[PDB]
Design a protein around this ligand. Structure first.
Ligand SMILES: [Zn+2]
Length: 218
């Protein structure tokens, strides 16, 4: 886990809006789609379209994980970035993301499994809110997003400017697997590309046993 000194201070971030739009804006979601092309052996290009993009490239953990989902019909769910997102030169409407991929076949729930987010502020966990998905194995990225989307819009986690909280991070807790966490705030001078790499591992989770806690301080 993280120590107060391991956490990035929000008041130290330059252009924090750049995080804000990532979570304030809608995600990139797709259902039964198959890998169309590939730039580097560790990424997968999809001919999926969306507002502001007709192509999507996702960077995965490595080549192995990239060929592992290559010829499979997967579901995509992720927070994208455009600045520093290049492929060829004719594709002028592209968008990049890391991970956020999962097998489509046999990964669906007839009824959404809502997970309980334990938001603790300044040590007092006086808040609880739901978050749901239709996948049995979902990526921490799909869960992580919703968490921040909720908190942004209700607790003002982010704004088109500063943040009411000095520090903050999301902690994930797998049934029996070991835990991990993501710092809601970046380094002073960051880039969405670099920051988003917290989803490059594409670490999925069993939404039927996984737990989620959030630690925010003012
Ligand atoms: Zn699906």
């Amino acid at each position: 886990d993280p120590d107060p000194s391991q956490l990035h201070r929000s008041s130290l971030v330059k252009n924090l809006q750049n995080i804000y739009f990532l979570y304030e804006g809608d995600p990139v979601t797709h259902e039964n789609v198959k890998s169309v092309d590939q730039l580097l052996s560790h990424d997968l290009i999809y001919n999926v379209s969306g507002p502001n993009y007709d192509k999507l490239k996702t960077e995965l953990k490595n080549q192995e994980m990239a060929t592992l989902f290559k010829d499979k019909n997967v579901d995509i769910y992720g927070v994208e970035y455009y600045h520093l997102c290049y492929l060829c030169e004719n594709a002028e409407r592209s968008a990049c993301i890391y991970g956020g991929v999962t097998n489509h076949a046999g990964n669906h729930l007839e009824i959404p499994k809502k997970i309980v987010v334990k938001v603790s502020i300044d040590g007092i966990q006086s808040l609880s809110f739901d978050i749901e998905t239709n996948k049995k194995m979902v990526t921490a990225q799909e869960l992580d997003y919703k968490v921040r989307k909720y908190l942004t819009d209700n607790k003002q986690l982010y704004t088109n400017g500063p943040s009411k909280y000095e520090t903050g991070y999301i902690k994930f807790i797998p049934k029996n697997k070991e835990s991990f966490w993501f710092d809601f705030f970046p380094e002073p001078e960051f880039t969405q590309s670099k920051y988003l790499m917290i989803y490059k591992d594409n670490e999925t989770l069993d939404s039927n046993t996984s737990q989620i806690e959030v630690y925010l301080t003012t």
